[PDB]
């Protein structure tokens, strides 16, 4: 069909830019997590002992020097959790520029779409690095168990749990990276974001993106019926984790007044 080819060439385009923008794809994460072993076998951190024992191999050097070794383990892990967020935002930003028409919208809308969109995308991509037992870290060289993160000092202990809760339900849909590329594009171009000056051009692109996603899911998963509707229904789960993420940030801000934030997050954190 002549009109379907525009959507599939659009899917091929977003898939191509997805691979170019994100080094940690779901396919590589799944290769490490299944028992294909030898070279890509990760080191596992399950308790405070293995953590110090793995700092030789875990590359825990990416912790901010101003607020690094002096702080307790619970704050440091939170610091590394936020350091993987600046990297995702940078990559989502580079990814957003490749979505056709995005760079042609108003600048203020572009900043608005990224300010509210990156967090919903982060937890979507974080699910690719997760199973029921833990999450990949250090570019797949490490694996931090869900049990150990859950055991951290409060409220940092119950901060990774809602992401693990979302990952197990989201990973049940069995989407690959070709589907996630289009879905991530749909999340960016939401016309219902607060402060959008011109909403109509944003909705026009998301129509085209949703058309591409529905056709992509029908061809890549022909046996899974209503995968389109069930995938769109899981953003209600994505806005909830976001809303409790903003709730523990203001708690940490007044509990840990001596803790810095990366300027990219401090600007995103304004709601």
Ligand X SMILES: CCCCCN1C(=O)C(=O)c2cc(SCCc3ccc(C(=O)O)cc3)ccc21
Is 119 annotated to bind a ligand? Reply is yes
The mark string for 41-80 relative to Cl ion (x by CB under 5 A, - otherwise) is ----------------------------------------
Is 153 annotated to bind a ligand? Reply is no
Which residues lie across from 134 on neighbouring strands? Answer: 145
Q: Which is nearer to ligand X, 77 or 114 (CB)?
A: 77
Residue 26 has phi, psi (to 5 degrees) of -65, -35
Contact 188, 113 (CB under 8 A): yes
Interacting stretch for ligand X, rule CB under 6 A, among 32-40, 118-126, 187-195, 235-243? 118-126
Minimum gap (Å) between residue 88 Cβ and ligand X = 4
Minimum gap (Å) between residue 87 Cβ and Cl ion = 4
CA angle 172, 173, 176 (to 5 degrees): 115
The mark string for 135-154 relative to ligand X (x by CB under 6 A, - otherwise) is x-xx-----x----------
Which residues lie closer than 8 Å to 191 by C-beta, 6 or more apart? 199, 200, 202, 203, 206
Q: Can residue 122 be called a binding residue for ligand X (CB under 6 A)?
A: yes
Minimum gap (Å) between residue 59 Cβ and ligand X = 6
Q: Can residue 88 be called a binding residue for ligand X (CB under 6 A)?
A: yes
Q: Which is nearer to ligand X, 128 or 216 (CB)?
A: 128
Neighbours of 156 (CB within 10 A): 20
**139: region left, alpha or beta (phi > 0 left; psi from -120 to 50 alpha):** left
Q: Which is nearer to ligand X, 10 or 125 (CB)?
A: 125
| Closest among 164, 155, 162 to 77, alpha carbons compared | 155
Contact pick of 11, 126, 186, 210 for ligand X (by CB under 6 A): 126
For the chain, helix, strand, coil in percent to 5 are 65, 5, 30
Residue 145 has phi, psi (to 5 degrees) of -70, 150
Q: Can residue 54 be called a binding residue for ligand X (CB under 6 A)?
A: no
> How many angstroms separate the CA atoms of 181 and 235, rounded?
15
Contact pick of 26, 84, 119, 163 for Cl ion (by CB under 5 A): 84
> How many angstroms separate the CA atoms of 158 and 41, rounded?
28
Q: Can residue 125 be called a binding residue for ligand X (CB under 6 A)?
A: yes
CA 146, 67, 142, 114 torsion: positive or negative?
positive
Helix (H, G, I), strand (E, B) or coil at 31: helix
Q: Which is nearer to Cl ion, 43 or 228 (CB)?
A: 43
Residue 24 has phi, psi (to 5 degrees) of -100, 85
Is 84 annotated to bind a ligand? Reply is yes
**Number of shown-chain residues binding ligand X (CB under 6 A):** 19
List residues forming the annotated binding site.
82-85, 119, 245, 269
Binding stretches for Cl ion (CB under 5 A): 84, 87
List residues forming the annotated binding site for rosiglitazone.
82-85, 119, 245, 269
Binding stretches for ligand X (CB under 6 A): 58-60, 77, 80-81, 84-85, 88, 122, 125-126, 129, 135, 137-138, 144, 160, 163
């Amino acid at each position: 069909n002549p009109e379907s080819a525009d959507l599939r060439a659009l899917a091929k385009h977003l898939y191509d830019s997805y691979i170019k923008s994100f080094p940690l794809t779901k396919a590589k994460a799944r290769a490490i997590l299944t028992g294909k072993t030898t070279d890509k076998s990760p080191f596992v951190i399950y308790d405070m002992n293995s953590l110090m024992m793995g700092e030789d191999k875990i590359k825990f050097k990416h912790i901010t020097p101003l607020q690094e070794q002096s702080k307790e383990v619970a704050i440091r892990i939170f610091q590394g959790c936020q350091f993987r967020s600046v990297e995702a935002v940078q990559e989502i930003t580079e990814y957003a520029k490749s979505i056709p028409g995005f760079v042609n919208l108003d600048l203020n809308d572009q900043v608005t779409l990224l300010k509210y969109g990156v967090h919903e995308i982060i937890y979507t991509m974080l699910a690719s690095l997760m199973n029921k037992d833990g999450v990949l870290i250090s570019e797949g060289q490490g694996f931090m168990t869900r049990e150990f993160l859950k055991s951290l000092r409060k409220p940092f202990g119950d901060f990774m749990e809602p992401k693990f809760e979302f990952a197990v339900k989201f990973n049940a849909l069995e989407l690959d990276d070709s589907d996630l590329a289009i879905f991530i594009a749909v999340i960016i171009l939401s016309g219902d974001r607060p402060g959008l000056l011109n909403v109509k051009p944003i909705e026009d692109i998301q129509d085209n993106l949703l058309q591409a996603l529905e056709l992509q899911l029908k061809l890549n998963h022909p046996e899974s019926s209503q995968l389109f509707a069930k995938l769109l229904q899981k953003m209600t789960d994505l806005r909830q984790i976001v809303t409790e993420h903003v709730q523990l940030l203001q708690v940490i801000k007044k509990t840990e007044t001596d803790m810095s934030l990366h300027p990219l997050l401090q600007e995103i954190y304004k709601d």
